[PDB]
Design an enzyme around this catalytic site. Structure first.
Site, mmCIF file in Angstrom:
data_model
loop_
_atom_site.group_PDB
_atom_site.id
_atom_site.type_symbol
_atom_site.label_atom_id
_atom_site.label_comp_id
_atom_site.label_asym_id
_atom_site.label_seq_id
_atom_site.Cartn_x
_atom_site.Cartn_y
_atom_site.Cartn_z
ATOM 1 N N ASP B 214 1.154 -23.167 11.616
ATOM 2 C CA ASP B 214 -0.089 -23.787 12.098
ATOM 3 C C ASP B 214 -0.579 -24.928 11.215
ATOM 4 O O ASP B 214 -0.458 -24.859 9.988
ATOM 5 C CB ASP B 214 -1.214 -22.752 12.186
ATOM 6 C CG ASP B 214 -0.901 -21.623 13.138
ATOM 7 O OD1 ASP B 214 -0.187 -21.855 14.131
ATOM 8 O OD2 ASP B 214 -1.385 -20.503 12.885
ATOM 9 N N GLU B 256 2.928 -25.659 15.961
ATOM 10 C CA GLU B 256 1.672 -25.856 16.685
ATOM 11 C C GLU B 256 1.216 -27.277 16.403
ATOM 12 O O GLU B 256 0.580 -27.556 15.382
ATOM 13 C CB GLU B 256 0.605 -24.847 16.234
ATOM 14 C CG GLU B 256 -0.821 -25.116 16.780
ATOM 15 C CD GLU B 256 -1.750 -25.753 15.746
ATOM 16 O OE1 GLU B 256 -1.374 -25.820 14.555
ATOM 17 O OE2 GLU B 256 -2.863 -26.187 16.121
#
Ligand SMILES: C[C@H]1O[C@H](O[C@H]2[C@H](O)[C@@H](O)[C@@H](O[C@H]3[C@H](O)[C@@H](O)[C@@H](O)O[C@@H]3CO)O[C@@H]2CO)[C@H](O)[C@@H](O)[C@@H]1N[C@H]1C=C(CO)[C@@H](O)[C@H](O)[C@H]1O
Ligand code: CA
Ligand code: CA
Ligand code: CL
Ligand code: CL
Ligand code: CL
Ligand code: CL
Ligand code: CL
Ligand code: CL
Ligand code: CL
Ligand code: MG
Ligand code: MG
Lengths: 548, 571
Positions: B214, B256
């Site tokens: 992330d 992501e």
């Protein structure tokens, strides 16, 4: 304004006065309340209300036990409220018919009380009396689990009296000409008030004769002819509907003499339709429907079948069948769904386990098959039932208007309601009610209203011919309804899975199928078989438009 | 830091370098799934007990959002210790037990790992601010001013006044792309790079099957740039991929990157090496485009993002899901220059009302069952590996007032019992309450109620997953959009390049047809190249008429779809 064919174009809406709307906070629906909800009924798009019995009655058999034919049950209002209802309905183009039990009265009826207390008086022969219980031995006991005999010994008169229904429902003596005149006078009383017609209940049982099973006697049909004649002569444009829970071949007699164009009832109900549709879907085969329709004899051109999505007659709670002529006779008992609900009225959504796709399919069939359809109040929002209330009362709970207290049916305390609303997680009024469904164009209510609007724009659905198209796939039922230039094609998938069907539509070569809700034009019909593909339990309606 | 050896390890599945291409992922929060110890909070042991349901449903890999030790000021994306599970969830040992039990059923597990930043409660940061000349002094990005990197936007512009925050102890400013309590790690310090690779190795040694990495676009900052997508950032990602492939073959890295698809392609890495960065990345614009295609009853918004999506490396796969927002930032991806629908979302009142809020599928579609099926069909048949979000399979609702992320994080609704059968705790002790309204409440919507009827959404979804799992074209097939007369219908064929074991339904071509109109629609398809083939509808197995030289007519109900196996004709 007379329109001798209105009943052929009508969609009926069976609605119980007690259940629809309580305007006076006594916990019981009433005529004024029903009047206040006529804008909803108009908006829904139905053409005629069918009211179950609302006469004065001790209500021991759901009001089918009548104490006074001339008086409204007092908790519903008076005849003045009934006229107010009639006028308000007519003002909106809506007609009203009601149930009228012809065979018998309550034992509380003043006629019967005079008959038993004063045998020599003018009511002494208004009922069927005997020193013995031996007469008419070939007549079955309809309620065989409850009544030991069709004869009951009266402790005041000390003779037996006849009753085909419960013991508190003595049969009228139709061999007495004063009884025939009195009952004709009941018809005229309500007709004078302005009612648009009656469903005549229990008429197969009017006359009894030794050597017979005491149903369908010629004298019974003769009296029905008197009823039709009185209507024809004095009140043109009114309707008589027969409630004969019999195989369709046997029911055609109730339309009367074919040479006359029909001289008894204008309409009669086609009872086996729903059981056959139900089994067609269970078996994923069009044949139970194809066969019942193909085997139904022609009726007078003046007449019309009534159809509805119920498996039981509301009077007797019996499902029609026939050992000899129903090829499905033994099959119903093999289906656990049919078996569980024997002798109990259930609403449409519960009958179909709340499957929205099937509700739509069954409703489409109701609205496109030959006959005038009857919608039952609440089925348009997907109401449930409460079976523990009774075999009939299961489907007679209050109309669910809003998610408010008492489903918005009444301002009374919940304990004073005549019956409680559904309260479970699936059918309860917190989730199922008119108000919640008014918004979304995709609600069952708005879908049903739209389907009614579509049907109303095509005379073929009401009075058109019926031609079943066959096709490659036995899981799909396809047919054309035609009036002569209004031609509609209906295709219905009885299978839970997607299905293709190839149709021989060569007769309509060149025509353009226009689907009736989005008005999308489909490929023109040619000489090759026309391929339609349907999702599980899907259906399409097409207008067959002539070429340029 | 803990040392992996000190723990058990899960038994590894046989290595399968392409497993993630064939996988259906199931995003499930540990806190939400099942509370096994009556503290009102879901836990690892509880999730372990529910593996039977997950297996029955037929998903291939669990995706767990962060479950590390955290003060939970930003949903747990603010991590206080990378080596420790949040105590309420259990311990590292419980995680190993979960992994082993999942692996026994052939189920894999990946988790989110936030690479860009830690909580300010992390000991690295406490040491960095208290002891500037110590070994953690340069673990974060410190400055005497707040003037550096002015071209970087403030992501949370309505909450954070600056990307620099003055620290009261160290008396310097530190950098954070996210909230002020989430200081950015200094990736220019090679000790930080090694520390983070060590985090990956810790969980990989335990036996985890991979990570969604992330906030990776924000790793490195450079003057004169907007501090996203820098070369040094991609170079670090190559290190992660190198470590992964050399030391733990058969694991996966998902990126992501909430960016336009042409831009996220870089995150797969060098096409010449077959891809040397992340194995997977998310295709974020898909759902907003599908959503718009249905609203306008036109295939084009879907046709177009697919056509404009650039080719990706052979080892790589797109991830897809039915959400309009990234869970980290709650932003919907868009692009002024390259998205032709850029200004159109703001014209849709449904889209408008939900800006910045995660919503579940059924609520997004106003609980319309036909649309839920249509969107689910698309998710399961379009190119990519799909992610299902826990609860969408039973049509769970959400509770928007709980927060922009927590709206969709309410307990899994197992039964109509107390607390939806999620917990034996008192209701006031639940971490979040279940839905209680008439439409989505647990009295109406729960697993138990849907298990019986084969017509429930749950049973329908489970069958669709089963059908998908038996046809390779859905996972790794080509994508050929078929056009057609009717712009309201999206039709495509997907094909497998054969080899080895030839035919069988598993490698036959598949034809998918989707009606974006709410009305019945006809479509005539030019399928002449498949002349003679027999379309067999996949759910009921009914044979449709053989394809000929004439256009092939299919009719669909409103929002309907069909899936067909194209079967080769008899000789
Ligand atoms: C019964 C039918 O209900 C629905 O159809 C309606 C729409 O969804 C509404 O949006 C509304 O549409 C119209 C526009 O709002 C209005 O601007 C007008 O000018 O354009 C429209 C008029 O076509 O009304 C629709 C109906 O008029 C639902 O969408 C639909 O698919 C449902 N359809 C079935 C009915 C038949 C019988 O013809 C079958 O052929 C089908 O297969 C059923 O699915
Ligand atoms: Ca009689
Ligand atoms: Ca950074
Ligand atoms: Cl009533
Ligand atoms: Cl009265
Ligand atoms: Cl009836
Ligand atoms: Cl029934
Ligand atoms: Cl969690
Ligand atoms: Cl996300
Ligand atoms: Cl979302
Ligand atoms: Mg009242
Ligand atoms: Mg717990």
């Amino acid at each position: 304004p007379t329109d001798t064919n209105w009943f052929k174009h009508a969609v009926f809406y069976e609605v119980l006065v007690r259940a629809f709307y309580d305007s006076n906070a006594d916990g019981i629906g009433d005529l004024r309340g029903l009047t206040e909800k006529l804008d909803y009924i108009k908006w829904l798009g139905v053409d005629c209300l069918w009211l179950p019995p609302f006469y004065d009655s001790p209500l021991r058999d759901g009001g089918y036990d009548i104490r006074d034919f001339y008086k409204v049950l007092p908790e519903f209002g008076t005849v003045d409220d009934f006229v107010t209802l009639l006028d308000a309905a007519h003002r909106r183009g809506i007609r009203i018919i009601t149930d009228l039990v012809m065979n018998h009265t309550s034992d509380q009826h003043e006629w019967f009380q005079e008959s038993r207390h004063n045998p020599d008086g003018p009511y002494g022969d208004f009922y069927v009396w005997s020193d013995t219980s031996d007469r008419y031995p070939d007549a079955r006991i309809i309620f065989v689990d409850t009544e030991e005999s069709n004869w009951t010994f009266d402790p005041v008169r000390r003779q037996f009296y006849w009753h085909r229904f419960f013991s508190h429902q003595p049969d009228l003596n139709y061999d007495n000409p004063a009884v025939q005149e009195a009952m004709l006078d009941v018809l005229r009383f309500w007709l004078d008030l302005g009612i648009d017609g009656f469903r005549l209940d229990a008429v197969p049982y009017l006359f009894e004769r030794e050597g017979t099973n005491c149903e369908n006697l010629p004298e019974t049909h003769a009296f029905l002819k008197r009823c039709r004649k009185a209507i024809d002569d004095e009140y043109p444009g009114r309707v008589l509907l027969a409630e004969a829970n019999q195989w369709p071949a046997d029911v055609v007699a109730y339309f009367g003499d074919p040479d006359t164009g029909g001289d008894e009832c204008h309409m009669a109900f086609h009872f086996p339709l729903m059981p056959r549709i139900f089994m067609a879907v269970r078996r994923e085969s069009r044949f139970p429907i194809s066969e019942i329709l193909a085997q139904t004899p022609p009726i007078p051109d003046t007449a019309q079948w009534g159809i509805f999505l119920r498996n039981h007659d509301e009077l007797t709670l019996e499902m029609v069948t026939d050992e000899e002529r129903d090829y499905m006779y033994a099959e119903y008992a093999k289906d656990p769904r049919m078996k569980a609900n024997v002798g109990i009225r259930r609403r449409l959504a519960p009958l179909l386990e709340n499957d929205r796709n099937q509700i739509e399919l069954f409703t489409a069939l109701l609205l496109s098959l030959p006959g005038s359809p009857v919608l039952y109040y609440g089925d348009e929002i997907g109401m449930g039932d409460i079976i523990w209330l009774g075999d009939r009362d299961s489907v007679r709970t209050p109309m669910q208007w809003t998610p408010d207290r008492n489903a918005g049916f009444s301002k009374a305390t919940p304990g004073r309601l005549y019956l409680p609303p559904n309260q479970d997680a699936v059918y309860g009024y917190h989730s199922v009610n008119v108000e919640a469904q008014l918004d979304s164009s995709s609600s069952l209510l708005n879908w049903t209203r739209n389907m009614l609007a579509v049907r109303s724009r095509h005379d073929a659905f009401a009075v058109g011919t019926f031609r079943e198209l066959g096709g490659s796939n036995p899981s799909v039922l396809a047919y054309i309804r035609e009036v002569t230039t209004d031609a509609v094609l209906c295709v219905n998938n009885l299978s839970r899975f997607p299905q293709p069907i190839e149709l021989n539509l060569q007769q309509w070569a060149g025509y353009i199928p226009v689907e009736m809700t989005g008005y999308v034009e489909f490929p023109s019909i040619g000489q090759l078989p026309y391929l339609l593909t349907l999702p599980g339990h899907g259906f399409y309606w097409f207008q067959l438009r002539e070429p340029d």
